[PDB]
Design an enzyme around this catalytic site. Structure first.
Site, PDB file in Angstrom:
ATOM      1  N   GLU A  69       0.799  -1.234   0.000  1.00 16.63           N
ATOM      2  CA  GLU A  69       0.000   0.000   0.000  1.00 16.63           C
ATOM      3  C   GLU A  69       0.836   1.291   0.000  1.00 16.63           C
ATOM      4  O   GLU A  69       0.719   2.140   0.893  1.00 16.63           O
ATOM      5  CB  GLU A  69      -1.036  -0.037   1.142  1.00 16.63           C
ATOM      6  CG  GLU A  69      -2.082  -1.123   0.918  1.00 16.63           C
ATOM      7  CD  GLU A  69      -3.167  -1.177   1.985  1.00 16.63           C
ATOM      8  OE1 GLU A  69      -2.849  -1.309   3.187  1.00 16.63           O
ATOM      9  OE2 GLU A  69      -4.356  -1.109   1.614  1.00 16.63           O
ATOM     10  N   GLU A 145      -4.377 -10.413  -0.591  1.00 17.98           N
ATOM     11  CA  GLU A 145      -5.347 -10.296   0.505  1.00 17.98           C
ATOM     12  C   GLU A 145      -6.726 -10.524  -0.067  1.00 17.98           C
ATOM     13  O   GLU A 145      -7.100  -9.898  -1.062  1.00 17.98           O
ATOM     14  CB  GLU A 145      -5.334  -8.904   1.140  1.00 17.98           C
ATOM     15  CG  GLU A 145      -4.025  -8.511   1.762  1.00 17.98           C
ATOM     16  CD  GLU A 145      -4.031  -7.117   2.338  1.00 17.98           C
ATOM     17  OE1 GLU A 145      -5.089  -6.689   2.850  1.00 17.98           O
ATOM     18  OE2 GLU A 145      -2.962  -6.464   2.283  1.00 17.98           O
ATOM     19  N   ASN A 205      -9.076   7.106  15.818  1.00 11.74           N
ATOM     20  CA  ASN A 205      -8.954   5.655  15.748  1.00 11.74           C
ATOM     21  C   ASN A 205      -9.910   5.043  14.731  1.00 11.74           C
ATOM     22  O   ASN A 205     -10.903   5.669  14.336  1.00 11.74           O
ATOM     23  CB  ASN A 205      -9.143   5.021  17.134  1.00 11.74           C
ATOM     24  CG  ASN A 205     -10.472   5.386  17.775  1.00 11.74           C
ATOM     25  OD1 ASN A 205     -10.722   6.547  18.098  1.00 11.74           O
ATOM     26  ND2 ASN A 205     -11.326   4.390  17.971  1.00 11.74           N
TER      27      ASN A 205
END
Ligand code: NA
Ligand code: NA
Ligand code: NA
Ligand code: NA
Lengths: 211, 211
Positions: A69, A145, A205
């Site tokens: 990424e 993935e 978060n």
């Protein structure tokens, strides 16, 4: 790159390993801002080259990865070629920039679907079946993935495996992922409980997305 | 090859034509018993060469075909190359011998399905989506015959079209076929009715299969 013992254990027990350079610049805008900048080439080269120098004698390592990424930049192309020149014994893969760039020997998308195209601009995620036969495409496809296993999940897993078995050049993939990233916290008694993002006063978060 | 006026009309009205040599040896055992025999080359060559010499100036003819259901013989290879040499302006296709032999520029199976393989020995009919990406394969795929329109038929026709639209290299096909081969017969009153195979005393016959 993992703890040196991990490779030794994969050598002895028998697992195929993708050894991956410690490079992720996910947060940059665009994702290749640093990886296309020649001034960041030295830092990036050390993360690739010192990995190869450490791990090249492990039979369990079958593929090198340029990281994760970080978009696709010219530094990827440079480091791809460096590995192919220094160690011809292993394919090099890298997903950034659309999973099928010039810095990868293997079409290696994340979360590309079996039958359904997701035609994002610039970085489309084609159906894995369709991707294989795009005009001029010859490479094998192995998802870096897939089957995001967050909570109550792995729906449609069987659909991947049916296609893996029917199409020679679809050679599987790596589920995301192995273990929930929950940490242990305590209440007022001394009773342990599983803590995720946000439970240490941490902000901003992404919450339960670690599991 | 068709009545000469056909090509003129297809030129003026606008249709793409596959012009095909008058060679079908379907009933041989095995199918290529004649087409692999060099003694039958002279006769085969004239059916190919004389067609090309007749029809090469028609814009509507965009592809040459070596015939139909005659297996794959060395005579097909010779004649494939004769056309490529004499007329570079058009691809050559031929379905016999498994639809993807050295004698065709186009993968041109008959009745290959969209998702299901039919793995016949020697001459498999892979799913068309799978065929495209077989290790090494680069050619486009156009079914020379699909969607058998026999009586109450054409179920699943939409499935073909979805795949044609999704896969660049799936570039369509030719439905089998246009017109019922029924004939007009008469009885004691003078009633005009539609006659199929067997209704003329002909034996052996294959009945309604001509329609
Ligand atoms: Na496979
Ligand atoms: Na996550
Ligand atoms: Na298409
Ligand atoms: Na028929």
């Amino acid at each position: 790159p993992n703890h040196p013992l991990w490779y030794t254990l994969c050598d002895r027990y028998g697992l195929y390993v993708v050894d991956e350079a410690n490079i992720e610049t996910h947060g940059m805008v665009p994702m290749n801002r640093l990886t296309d900048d020649p001034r960041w080439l030295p830092a990036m080269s050390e993360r690739v080259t010192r990995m190869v120098q450490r791990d090249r004698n492990h039979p369990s390592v079958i593929i090198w990865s340029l990281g994760n990424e970080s978009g696709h930049g010219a530094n990827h192309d440079a480091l791809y070629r460096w590995i192919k020149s220094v160690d011809p014994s292993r394919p090099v893969q890298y997903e950034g920039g659309g999973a099928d760039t010039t810095a990868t020997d293997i079409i290696c998308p994340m979360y590309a679907r079996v039958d359904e195209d997701q035609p994002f601009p610039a970085v489309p995620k084609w159906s894995i079946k369709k991707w294989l036969s795009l005009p001029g495409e010859t490479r094998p496809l192995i998802l870096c993935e897939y089957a995001h296993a967050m909570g109550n999940s792995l729906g449609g897993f069987a659909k991947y495996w049916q296609a893996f078995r029917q199409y020679p050049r679809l050679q599987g993939g790596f589920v995301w992922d192995w273990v929930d990233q929950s940490l242990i916290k305590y209440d007022e008694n001394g009773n342990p409980w599983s803590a995720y993002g946000g439970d240490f006063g941490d902000t901003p978060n992404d919450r339960q997305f670690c599991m």
